[PDB]
Amino acid sequence: AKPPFVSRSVLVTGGNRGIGLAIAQRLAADGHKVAVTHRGSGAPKGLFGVEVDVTDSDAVDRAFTAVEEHQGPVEVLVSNAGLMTEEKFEKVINANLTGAFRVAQRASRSMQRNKFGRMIFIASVQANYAASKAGVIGMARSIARELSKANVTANVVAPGYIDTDMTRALDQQGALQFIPAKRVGTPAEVAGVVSFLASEDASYISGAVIPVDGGMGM
Amino acid sequence: AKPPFVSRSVLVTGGNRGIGLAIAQRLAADGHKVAVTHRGSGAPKGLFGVEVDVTDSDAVDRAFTAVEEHQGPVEVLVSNAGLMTEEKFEKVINANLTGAFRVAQRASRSMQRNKFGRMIFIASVQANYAASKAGVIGMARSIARELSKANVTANVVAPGYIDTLQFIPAKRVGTPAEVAGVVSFLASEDASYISGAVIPVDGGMGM
Amino acid sequence: AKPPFVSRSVLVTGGNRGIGLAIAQRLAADGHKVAVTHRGSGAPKGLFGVEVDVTDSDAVDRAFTAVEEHQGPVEVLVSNAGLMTEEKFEKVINANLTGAFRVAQRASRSMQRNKFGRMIFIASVQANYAASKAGVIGMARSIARELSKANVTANVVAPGYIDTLQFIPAKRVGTPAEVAGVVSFLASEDASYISGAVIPVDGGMGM
Amino acid sequence: AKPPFVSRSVLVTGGNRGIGLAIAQRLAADGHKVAVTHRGSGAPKGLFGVEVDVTDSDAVDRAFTAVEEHQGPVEVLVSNAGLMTEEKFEKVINANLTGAFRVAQRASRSMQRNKFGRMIFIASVQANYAASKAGVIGMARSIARELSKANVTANVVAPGYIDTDMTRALDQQGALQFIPAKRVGTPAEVAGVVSFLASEDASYISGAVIPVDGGMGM
User: Fold this and answer.
1) Beta B33-38 vs A117-122: how paired, if at all?
2) How far is CA B125 from CA B80, B132, B165, in A?
3) What 3-state class would DSSP assign to C200?
4) Which residues lie below 8 Å from residue B103, measured CB to CB, with a gap of 6+?
5) CB distance A57–D86 less than 8 Å?
6) Is residue A208 within 8 Å of residue A157, measured between CB atoms?
7) How far does CA D183 lie from the centroid of its chain?
8) Side-chain half-sphere CA neighbours of B170 within 13 A
């Protein structure tokens, strides 16, 4: 007894490259209406693009508004990262943690009003990155606590070792000792999880962290 | 970029009632070849059933054998829990913890040999239940560590309050179908890189 | 602002060797009244010992009784683990999981009645061990939920590699004394508001 | 076989009030050399005080230096918090997360050189607070990973409901349903845990989160 498909207004932050693109293209193939944010380089053919520096609250506000006018209010929000000294630490925190907050907060009133919302946070694949990842999880669990009564869930996807364009650039196999699956994952493997969390099957999952790591984070 | 569907040989333990039945029915509608074990009340209409007491290793072996003949070697195992004194403690541990081991072990040979397997353990919705459920998660994580190299994963679904409340973020109970939805995903081609995970299906309860 | 010392009646299961012995010796030096169970090789010099097979509920009851007479009703229980086929699986589950339940249950009446108790379960340093250890944590959390109102806590110590390595942040093994140090703290007046916790003693390993 | 006591150079951030003071006074009663940071109001009689806004990297630097000259390099660091809109969110993140980083980073070189260090982070007792608490844990686990080989551990203390001066000001008993112990904890109960983590008995605990919550966070 599978729930009939509903085509959602979807926003994928950083949806023009790497894992973000895989997610964006999967969700579009699913039958959703998919928009993406980028840093200026352009949204991939097919999809609706807005330029957004997630460090900037006004840019986020204007982005959501252009999306709203284009395809209706954001129902499904996929938040992708984002990006030792004080400057390096605050930069990653601003992009990856506070950037997640900014987009989540801009999304929340519309989702609460409409009694539908899926916030899906993609954790980064080092003190700054560890801190911002754990912070997003803490934040997501907190959004889940407040908003779930309104049918607005917040869940996290925690990717393990995934083959990106930039992953392939490293001297890499020492990582496989720590992975029970004994292999790297694909961008498509992560996008499959986002697709499920975006579907009508995930309505009773809220405040969860799903690891997509071949067993690594056990 | 969806991966093409593959019809799997599925065994659902306790697939005749409640959460078990909804799982068996969803997987059949998904397009899998679905068999169920049951305690004696009968399989669901149309689906191949076998009577199994999961405290009985020989009854486990017979069931798997009869299923292998019917529809081919078991590729995906959905293990549903079968249900303070020393007697009651050991009973629940035998059914819910050792029972999961018995089915997981009987399934594992053919999964490793054939280089595909998905083990999906559904935790139970007292000291004995707490220990059985936690014991299953530890056992699943251990199987995940051993067999993931052979494309054989082990994951756990942790249901909350399912109808078969203020202290729940969602402020409602879950349906048996919301559980079966997650099992359908775990049994699908989209879950290949998930292994050793506990997916809570509880509307935010166990956070 | 340290709370004054109270000499507790302590039972340490398997307190005759390895981690068990170091725990029993530390607690005795701390100033507690320390008894140990053992498998038959004998108690440590000076300490009151009783032979117990933790798979035997009646042997558990007898031991507690003999200890109550010797030094007074057990106030702090340190439960040390006693140590793939269906036979080997059930064996480890009986000793490490059900064995912990048997001692925890025999201890609990007097702790609730007397409004003080500290249960300290030492996890083991395979599918059976993974399940037993995870099962003990779930059981400890359950006891913690039930009995904490009566000033009866249950906590778990999870030791890593203990000498009784690159994949360890500390880059060394732990001593049996580093484990006993944490048990000493858990048995002390400083631990009253810790209940249902798993304290890892592993140099960062299980992070 | 208890390890002989060693009197450590200790720094307690926010050690002049509430749980911070309890910790500071306990550690001093233990026999450590205890310094505290404050916001201007003064360190409690007995103890060495430095004024430090943990938002300010230069103030942190000068504080550690005054402590070093007074009683020797910081061996034991107790980091106390610290303190929905963007401003409120970034303020709590700056004080509670980046503030933790600042003091941890200023402490680290001396601890690494001397092959001794105990970093103990006291988590706050809401999206901003949840995020910063989870972030500190993520950070601490990351410090533990890098520094433990040099005998520098990082552990977290996660207080449940504790009776402060400010706790007593709230309409409070609805909290007790969620606490198996069925009572509030005392500042002294938390300080007892810090005392253990600061002692010679905690050397093989690193990257741990100890909850002091009567069972609450189970």
Assistant:
1) unpaired
2) 10, 12, 14
3) strand
4) B11, B13, B54, B60, B77, B79
5) yes
6) no
7) 23
8) 24
Tell me the fold of C1-207: Rossmann fold (3.40.50)
Buried b (16+ CB within 10 A) or exposed e, D97-134: bbbbbbbbbbbbebbbeeebbbbbbbbbbebbbbbbbb
Maximum Cα–Cα distance across chain D:
54
Cα nearest neighbour of C30 on chain D: D2
Touching check for B133 and chain C: CB below 8 Å? yes
Both tokens assigned to B133 = 């459920």
Where in chain B are the domains? 1-207
Chains A and D form CB pairs within 8 A to the count of 81
Write the DSSP string, B140-184.
HHHHHHHHGGGTEEEEEEEE-SB---TTSTT-SPBPHHHHHHHHH
The amino acid sitting at D163 is: D
The residue type at C82: G
Q: Which residues of C are catalytic?
A: 129
Is A210 within 8 Å of B196 when comparing Cβ atoms? Answer: no
**Euclidean distance between CA atoms B130 and B143, whole angstroms:** 20
Inter-chain CB proximity A180 and B145 less than 8 Å: yes
Q: Which two tokens stand for residue D74?
A: 């910081």
Q: What is the dihedral of CA B137, B140, B146, B152, to 10 degrees?
A: -150
Pairing of strands D9-12, D76-80: parallel
* Strand segments (E) across C15-127: 33-38, 48-51, 76-80, 117-122
A124/chain D closest Cα distance in angstroms: 13
Query: Is D59 in contact with C35 (CB distance < 8 Å)?
Result: no
Start-to-end CA distance of chain B, whole Å, equals 32
d(CA C179, CA C1): 25
| H or E element at residue B123 | none
- Its CATH class, for the domain covering D1-218, is alpha beta
d(CA D92, CA A98): 11
CA pair distance D193, D206, nearest whole angstrom: 14
Closest alpha carbon to C52 in C81, C16, C13: C13
Give the helix ranges, DSSP H, for chain A: 18-30, 57-71, 86-92, 99-114, 127-147, 187-198
Whether C173 contacts chain D with CB within 8 A? no
Dihedrals phi, psi of A78, to nearest 5 degrees = -105, 110
Tokens of D67: 């402590």
The distance of Cα B117 from the centroid of its chain, to the nearest Å, equals: 13
Rounded to an integer, what distance in angstroms lies between the CA atom of residue B59 and that of residue B53? 7
